[PDB]
Design a protein around this ligand. Sequence first.
Ligand SMILES: [Ca+2]
Ligand SMILES: [Ca+2]
Ligand SMILES: [Ca+2]
Ligand SMILES: [Ca+2]
Ligand SMILES: [Cl-]
Ligand SMILES: [Cl-]
Ligand SMILES: [Cl-]
Ligand code: NA
Ligand code: NA
Ligand code: NA
Ligand code: NA
Ligand code: NA
Ligand SMILES: [Zn+2]
Length: 316
Amino acid sequence: ITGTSTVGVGRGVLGDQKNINTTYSTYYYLQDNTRGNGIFTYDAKYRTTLPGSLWADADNQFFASYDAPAVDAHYYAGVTYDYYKNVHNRLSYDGNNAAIRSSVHYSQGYNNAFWNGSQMVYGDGDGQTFIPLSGGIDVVAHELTHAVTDYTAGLIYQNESGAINEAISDIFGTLVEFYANKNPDWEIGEDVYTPGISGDSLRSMSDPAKYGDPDHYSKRYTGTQDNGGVHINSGIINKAAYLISQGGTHYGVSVVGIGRDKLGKIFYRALTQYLTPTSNFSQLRAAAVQSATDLYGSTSQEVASVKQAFDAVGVK
Ligand SMILES: [Ca+2]
Ligand SMILES: [Ca+2]
Ligand SMILES: [Ca+2]
Ligand SMILES: [Ca+2]
Ligand SMILES: [Cl-]
Ligand SMILES: [Cl-]
Ligand SMILES: [Cl-]
Ligand code: NA
Ligand code: NA
Ligand code: NA
Ligand code: NA
Ligand code: NA
Ligand SMILES: [Zn+2]
């Protein structure tokens, strides 16, 4: 819609207060005009027809219980856009400042979020397994990163390609969560998962086996469920990226970390220059060694830690 750019205030899913970019034309809309061609948050109104209706508000104040998931989807979309712009010089997910669209209140008691090929969508949860899923920044950045992957490497959402697709989204969702600060960790979804049960999360990168996910190639899932285990075998790659950033010993192999920023530089170069729709873990190993050599040199420390971490998770 067209109007004047303004700034509202609202409260997020976890009860914090934040400023959001809005647009005024009779109503205030959840339309951030400051970032590329815009950030648009919609109300799905407990249905599954998408996108629904652009979020309109009467007074530019977003403190209603109904408003909190919209506040966070709008806000964390903006933070993720700022991450990709300021750290990797990507203008939105296509590199050309595409519009970012999100719907909230999708369905009833819907315990997931996803990228549907065109927009993000967030359920409210059922209040015991999940609270509204946009409340977690690593969730929002994870889902947005599927769009980045679709537009670059194009990783097929199945078998090893899909575990890589999944692991990339976890990696950058965490890197965004660190970038914004606010209690960063190597866990996925701890902020919106199982209200009333502290300490847990959907997935762990530091130790994926805490939730039964493989942390080594020998332990890979080889069957039918979850599109060939794309949410399960991602633990193998998630552990490698953890080892690369923070270092550690894992199945006897010791790895020295090179920090968050360098994990980012190297994996972004892998995704946008070297990965193909059908890459598997071994090509992911080679792709990541090349970026390290590209950015740091044939005999860098960086090429060394990459090789080690993949040795540590058993990827040849
Ligand atoms: Ca209001
Ligand atoms: Ca956290
Ligand atoms: Ca996290
Ligand atoms: Ca919990
Ligand atoms: Cl309502
Ligand atoms: Cl998905
Ligand atoms: Cl997903
Ligand atoms: Na703020
Ligand atoms: Na801002
Ligand atoms: Na299934
Ligand atoms: Na640590
Ligand atoms: Na060389
Ligand atoms: Zn995903």
